[PDB]
């Protein structure tokens, strides 16, 4: 069954990929090569062209992603050659540096060797390559609650956080053959962070808020033509609402709305004053202002939705079916102000794509 699944996925991907690349005449011979390769080895190896276009198609097929207009300019780094934990570490350091690009963020994916018999070659434990630690002990909450379990797992391995609200977690990953992951502290020179200030309200800096520049998801599986790249971290630039309406605002994250209300000079006592909504708007204005002022890439949700509208138009013009997940495409601030809110989307799963996988901690 395994090989049959692989071969069927392979035929569908190669046909589609080569058609898009204008190389349809080569499909037959390539498929023959593949079929024999599967027969002999139990798997097959993507050409660099297939891997690159496959990663791009996967992004294009990501139903929940509003940022898909730019799918074809994804920067794909082929690291299927890595064999050592130093090579992996250095490839991850390099991804951060090249994606960050001094603030002019480049959407990038680094692709490590794929699973073989479902056996992972490299297993990345981080949810994002750059993320803050979280702690909870004796009623005291410090840092990002979303990172509590990973933070505890790191501290089991000999790492120790300073217990600031913004401790950078180390990179942590496990190699095939090793029982325990290794961890490496992030060189701070690699990590751009942005202090949050407000364009009009000087007191906003009193909150001492900041966030990191580049979100780099490192725990999803890239699937291309039946091959499972469980380790393939990717990044874009932030949409401001992710920081201002979720990371800093959610009660189960940094939970800052009451403190925001206070610094902007409004009462936080009555639902009918809409103080939470007002605080959310000002926090989200501060986030965009701060990233722009520092020269770090960011997009606001209105511009992002406008770009997504163009992605819809491009899909129809290219004769491709559009798929989307309305519940994730609408922004968490003023969603009815975007065209997304007012239409529906087919939530069908198309491959290549990115998929969740089980955490090795928890």
Ligand X SMILES: CNCCN(C)c1cccc(CCc2cc(C)cc(N)n2)n1
Query: Which of residues 161 and 244 has its CB atom nearest to ligand HEM in the complex?
Result: 244
Beta-carbon contacts of residue 201 (< 8 Å; ≥ 6 apart): 263, 264, 282, 286
Beta-strand runs (E) in the chain: 75-78, 108-111, 122-124, 134-137, 140-143, 171-175, 182-184, 193-195, 210-212, 216-217, 221-224, 227-229, 234-235, 238-239, 298-299, 353-355
How crowded is residue 163: how many other Cβ atoms within 10 Å of its Cβ? 13
78 binds ligand HEM (CB under 6 A): no
Q: Which two tokens stand for residue 155?
A: 């501290």
Residue from 237, 254, 275, 291 that binds ligand HEM (CB under 6 A)?
237
Subset of 234-263 contacting a second copy (CB under 8 A)? 245-246, 249-250, 257
Residue from 237, 333, 340, 352 that binds a second copy (CB under 8 A)?
333
74 binds ligand HEM (CB under 6 A): yes
Query: In this structure, what DSSP letter does residue 168 have?
Result: B
89 binds a second copy (CB under 8 A): no
Cβ(119)–Cβ(177) under 8 Å?
no
Query: Which of residues 204 and 237 has its CB atom nearest to ligand X in the complex?
Result: 237
Per CB under 6 A, which region of 3-11, 182-190, 215-223, 272-280 contacts ligand X? 215-223
Residue from 16, 65, 194, 216 that binds ligand HEM (CB under 6 A)?
65
Per CB under 8 A, which region of 81-89, 96-104, 171-179, 333-341 contacts a second copy? 333-341
What values do phi and psi take at 226, rounded to 5? Answer: 85, 0
Whether residue 152 is preceded by a cis peptide bond, meaning omega within 30 degrees of 0, is no
Residue from 236, 324, 331, 352 that binds ligand X (CB under 6 A)?
236
Catalytic residue among 65, 79, 115, 123: 65
Per the annotation, the verdict on 59 as an active-site residue is: no
Q: Point out the annotated binding site for heme.
A: 65
């Amino acid at each position: 069954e395994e090989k049959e699944i692989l071969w069927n996925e392979a035929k569908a991907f190669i046909a589609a990929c080569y058609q898009e690349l204008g190389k349809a005449a080569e499909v037959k011979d390539r498929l023959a090569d593949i079929k024999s390769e599967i027969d002999l080895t139990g798997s097959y190896v993507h050409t660099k062209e297939e891997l690159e276009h496959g990663a791009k198609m996967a992004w294009r097929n990501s139903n929940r992603c509003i940022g898909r207009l730019f799918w074809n300019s994804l920067n794909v780094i082929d690291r299927r050659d890595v064999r050592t934990k130093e090579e992996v570490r250095d490839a991850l350091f390099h991804h951060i540096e090249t994606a960050t690009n001094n603030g002019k963020i480049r959407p990038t994916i680094t692709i490590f060797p794929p699973e073989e018999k479902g056996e992972k070659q490299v297993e990345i434990w981080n949810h994002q390559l750059i993320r803050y630690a979280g702690y909870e002990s004796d009623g005291e909450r410090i840092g990002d609650p979303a990172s509590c379990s990973l933070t505890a797992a790191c501290e089991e391995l000999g790492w120790r956080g300073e217990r600031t609200d913004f401790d950078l977690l180390p990179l942590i990953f496990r190699m095939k053959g090793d029982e325990q992951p290794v961890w490496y502290e992030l060189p701070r020179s690699l990590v751009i962070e942005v202090p949050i200030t407000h364009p009009d309200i000087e007191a906003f800096s009193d909150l001492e808020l900041k966030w990191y520049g580049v979100p780099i998801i490192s725990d999803m599986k890239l699937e291309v033509g039946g091959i499972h790249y469980n380790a393939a971290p990717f990044n874009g630039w932030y949409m401001g609402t992710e920081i201002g309406a979720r990371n800093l605002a959610d009660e189960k994250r940094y939970d800052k709305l009451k403190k925001v209300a206070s610094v902007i000079g409004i009462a936080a006592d009555y639902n009918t004053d809409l103080w939470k909504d007002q605080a959310l708007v000002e926090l989200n204005k501060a986030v965009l202002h701060s990233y722009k002022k520092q020269g770090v890439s960011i997009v606001d949700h209105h511009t992002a939705a406008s770009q997504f509208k163009r992605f819809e138009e491009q899909a129809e013009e290219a004769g491709r079916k559009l798929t989307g997940d309305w519940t994730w495409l609408i922004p968490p601030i003023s969603p009815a102000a975007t065209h997304i809110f007012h239409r529906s989307y087919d939530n069908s799963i198309v491959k290549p794509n990115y998929f969740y996988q089980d955490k090795p901690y928890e």
